[PDB]
Amino acid sequence: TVHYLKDYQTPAYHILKTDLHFDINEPQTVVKSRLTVEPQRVGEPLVLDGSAKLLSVKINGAAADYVLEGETLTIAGVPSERFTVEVETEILPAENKSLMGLYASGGNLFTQCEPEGFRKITFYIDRPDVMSKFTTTIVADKKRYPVLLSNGNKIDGGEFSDGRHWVKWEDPFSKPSYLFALVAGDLAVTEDYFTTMSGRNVKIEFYTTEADKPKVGFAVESLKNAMKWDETRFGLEYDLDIFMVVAVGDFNMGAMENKGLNIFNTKFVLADSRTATDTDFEGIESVVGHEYFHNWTGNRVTCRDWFQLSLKEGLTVFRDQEFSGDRASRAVRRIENIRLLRQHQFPEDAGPTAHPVRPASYEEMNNFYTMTVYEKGAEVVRMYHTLLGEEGFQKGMKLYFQRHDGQAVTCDDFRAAMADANGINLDQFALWYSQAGTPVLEAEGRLKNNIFELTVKQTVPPTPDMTDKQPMMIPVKVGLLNRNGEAVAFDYQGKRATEAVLLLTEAEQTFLLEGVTEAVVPSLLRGFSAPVHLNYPYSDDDLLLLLAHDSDAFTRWEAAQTLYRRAVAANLATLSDGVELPKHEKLLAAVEKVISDDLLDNAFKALLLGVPSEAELWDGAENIDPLRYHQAREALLDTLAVHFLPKWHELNRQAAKQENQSYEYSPEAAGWRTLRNVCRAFVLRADPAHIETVAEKYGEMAQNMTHEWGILSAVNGNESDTRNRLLAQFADKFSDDALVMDKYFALVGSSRRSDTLQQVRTALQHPKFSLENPNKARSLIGSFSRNVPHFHAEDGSGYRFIADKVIEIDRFNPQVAARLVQAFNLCNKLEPHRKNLVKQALQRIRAQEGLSKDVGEIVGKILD
Ligand SMILES: CC(C)C[C@@H](N)P(=O)(O)O
Ligand SMILES: [Zn+2]
Known part of the structure; x- marks a missing residue:
């Protein structure tokens, strides 16, 4: 079954009121619904999505005649006007490893309903154009589950003799089923408030584990900033007197906007x-x-x-x-x-x-x-x-x-x-x-008479869904610089300005920027004005100019990106010829002027010193050997590291001095640290032995995680035994901190050392690793999957390892598995020996009995 946009049709039924009742027990939870249904197309069968164990169904209080087939429940004969459906279901939330629907995590219960998880809780019309008003009753043991939440306002609750207690939540805003949430558990609360622009107080409540509670202050403050900003920038105001946020350690995505009860992966909620x-x-x-x-x-x-x-x-x-x-x-x-x-x-x-x-x-x-x-x-x-x-x-x-x-x-x-x-x-x-597809702009510029004539062509390539691509509306923001690099005015569309937005709407156009009386170099696609590749035939000298003197951040950065890119291409040539590396003399000149320019924003400086990734460098190529792109990239970085080694120490020291022991998060302090971490990476490329020094004062350098992470990242590829000792010490110090353990695993998985595959296989058995935890799995396996020398090892080991883990994860969490299998997306663009190995592995994934639809869809696109 493929779903097509062209087949959209409105629902035959509307759901006006959705009354839910949850009875939480060990091990099972029982859900009784009461739906108020409104026929739109009278006489059609009532069709409900659902996959939970069905215990009973009723139409107006009476046992309904219905049929269950696959994940649908169908009731043929239904009233020609308003009626009720009552469905009773049973769920075993501790058995739910997919983390969709109602599931357990750390002894508590949470839900994740977007996009189609609700049908794992109850039978419903589980599609976002069906909007209903929900009221949710929850019953549970008080001591095990003192905290019981759902969307909206809490309007009632009580205690029972036997130790149970109950609550009732009413969300007065109609909503589609994907925005439903329930939480039940023993959780610590952090309380606060924001007053909206029209003088209403909004109670804020963040829920976390007792131990995680001290790490939630910055999230709270960020929320209060976000509420303020939506008022001032968009005129948007919050619409209830309560906003709740709940952290959970087992979560597939980043975070979830359920109405008044957002649920967040801990990693986007906890920090100190x-x-x-x-x-x-x-x-x-x-x-x-x-x-x-x-x-x-x-x-x-x-x-x-x-x-x-x-x-x-x-x-x-x-x-x-x-x-x-x-x-x-x-x-x-x-x-x-x-x-x-x-x-x-x-x-x-x-x-x-x-x-x-x-x-x-x-x-x-x-x-x-x-x-x-x-x-x-x-x-x-x-x-x-x-x-x-x-x-x-x-x-x-x-x-x-x-x-x-x-x-x-x-x-x-x-x-x-x-x-x-x-x-x-x-x-x-x-x-x-x-x-x-990404549109490609081909551009030419000619200064004749006093006009700068800018010709611009667009194509958009075929993609697998569509061959025909008509020209698009593409804004291109432009400036000009003279030989000394200053802005130059021109006349466009009446006005005389120093910058304009040229609106390309055809396959090819020429734009006339009149009134130019200097030799000029254009700056193009300022602010990255549209999401496209632009080629313009710039000299290195043109790029050096743009970099040193251009007024738009992106265009300056793109120019450095372009020099880096050209240098890597030069490296691929010589290594391919078996000759010495190029001297990249202009590049080195430009880097030097960046390193030494003290009028550059610190963070921007840091981005100017970043080299495009292997995926960017092989863009558009065929028959890719990823290791040869990797060896070219590595060579550049080694040249930059060795060539400027003592300037890397000085920059580091200036940055340390500027930081000024301000170890808490602030944009200002963070900028200095970003730059200091770029220097640390270069220093430990040029001089791996400096690790022993770094180790000697580790305590002294480790004033915050930004510093420990940046040092640990810089050495992560060092073949010293000390690299391993420091990781092991990091694991030990932060063993109780799950988000820090994710860092450890990411380091294990990303290392460029020769032994990473076996270190990864040992990490799988580390007492803090859980394959069933998405953060962990991504941290170790996802990272390994992106580790170019190791994932694309010539012997196939990397592809075989990743393919086994796709197979294994997909048995409990198809979502994580389908994201992981995409590491093979490069398949058809690889050189023949790796392609064969990739194709074998994808065939083996395909051959698994019971393979999810999630993973099947992706393997189809790669393979077929
Ligand atoms: C799938 C869902 C949990 C995530 C999104 N709604 P976002 O808000 O993270 O985009
Ligand atoms: Zn979102």
Whole structure:
């Protein structure tokens, strides 16, 4: 069964009220529902999704005639007007390792319903265009389960003689089933509040383990920032007098926006300076923000169907990105977002699983929680902002909510509102949702008479879903610099400005920027103005100029990225010829000017010193030997490390001095640490023996996790025995901290040392490792899967190991397995010996009896 967007039809039934009652016992939990049903297409059979053990079903209090087949329950004869359905189900939550539905974690009970988990709790119409008002009663042993939560307001509760107690939660806002949540357990509470702009108090409650409670203060503060910001930037206000957040250690995703009761992977909720990196702190802020932002972009307005997922996720990622940029370091954070997009989304769009931001079809929707839908999604939203300016963007938002509050809508609807609110036509803009693949811009510039003539071509390649790709609406932001690097004005569309947005809408256009009276070098796609590859024929000297002098952060960074890229290409040539490495003399010149320029933002400096990844370097190539790209990259870094070794120590020391013992998270302090960690990595490349020194004062350097992580990362590839001793000490010191143990496993899994495969196989049996825990599994196995020299070992060991673990995880958690199997996405682009080995492994996965739909769908795309 494949689901197609073209077949969407409205539901035959609506569900008006959903009354749930949960009776929690050992080992089983019994769910009794009462649904109020409203026929839309009278006489149609009533069709309910469900997979929990069914004990009884009734229509108006009476035993119903029905049939159960697969995961559907069908009742043929049903009233021609309002009726009730009552379903009784039974669940064994300790047996649930998929972590979808109602499941156990650390002795407590949690739910995860998006996208189709609710049907694992009860039989229901489990689709997001069906919206109902829920009231949830929960009964459980008081001592084992003192804390009992669901969405909305708590309106009643009591005690029973036998030790049980009960609560009743009423959520007055209609909602689709994926936004339901229940939590039951012995949990510590952290209390606070925010007062909305119209003077209402909102009680905030974070729930964690008793031991984890001291690590939740920064999450709380981030939430209060996020609430404030949604008021001031979007005019959005919270709509209940309670907001609850619950941390859980077994969780497949990052976090979940259930209405008034968000549930969060601990890793996006818990931090202190001793156990979390500054980056961990920044993740907490974006993710807490993100989930709070969903309250409007997702909850108040939800999705008509899952094909529309990006209507909530692209827009909400844009929101969280804007929140973080407004808090601090906007340009640096923009680049970070771009780099992530190019490093993970682009390879997606170039590979077997490429899909549109709004898929036309899917077998299993859990496979479409992807970088394309989320990050490419946010870029598309961002382009509306680019075309319309902030004020015009907020007008779209207003009309969006005016029209669609309380509805389940589509990406077309969102487009229409940005279009109608500003009286502009965005018909062509729809292709950003329906056409997959990364557009490629070919660009030429000519200065003749006093005009700079900029010719621009676009193609979008075929992807596996679609061959025909029509030209798109693509904004390209541009500047010019003279030989001395200063801004240059030009005349475009009437105005004389120093920058413009050129709007490419055709296969090829020329843009005339008139009034130029200097030799100029153009700066293109400023701010990464659209998610595309641009080729322009720049000299190295042109790049050196852009880098030293250009006013836009991205374009300066892209220029360094481009030099790094050219240097790696040069390295591949010589190593391939068996000759000495190139001298990269201009590059080294440029790095030196970056290292030494003290007017550069510290974090930005750090990004300028980052070399593109192996996946970026093999973009577009065929017959890839990943190790040869890896050896080329490694050679560059070794050259940079050795060549500038003493400047790496000095930068380090300047950064230490600037940090000034301010060990707590702050954007300012974090910037210095980011730079200090880049130096540590280069130093330990050039001089692995410096590890013994580092060890001698480890205590003294380990003033926070940012420092321990950065030192541990820098040595992680060192073949010294000391590397192993330090990891073992790290495991020992932080053995009770599960999020820190995830770091240990990530280090084990990512190491470039020659023995990583066996060290990984020992880690599987470490007393703190659980294959059944998604954080752990990703940490060790996911990391190994991305470890280029080891995953792509010529002997096939890496591919065989990963394929076994795909097979093994998929028996309890198909989601984690389907994410893992994507490590093989490069299959058809590898050189023949590795391709054969990859194809064998994918055949072996395919051959497993009982293989999930999740993994099957992915292996099909790679193999067939
Ligand atoms: C699948 C679900 C738990 C995650 C999303 N709704 P996000 O808010 O993490 O995007
Ligand atoms: Zn989300």
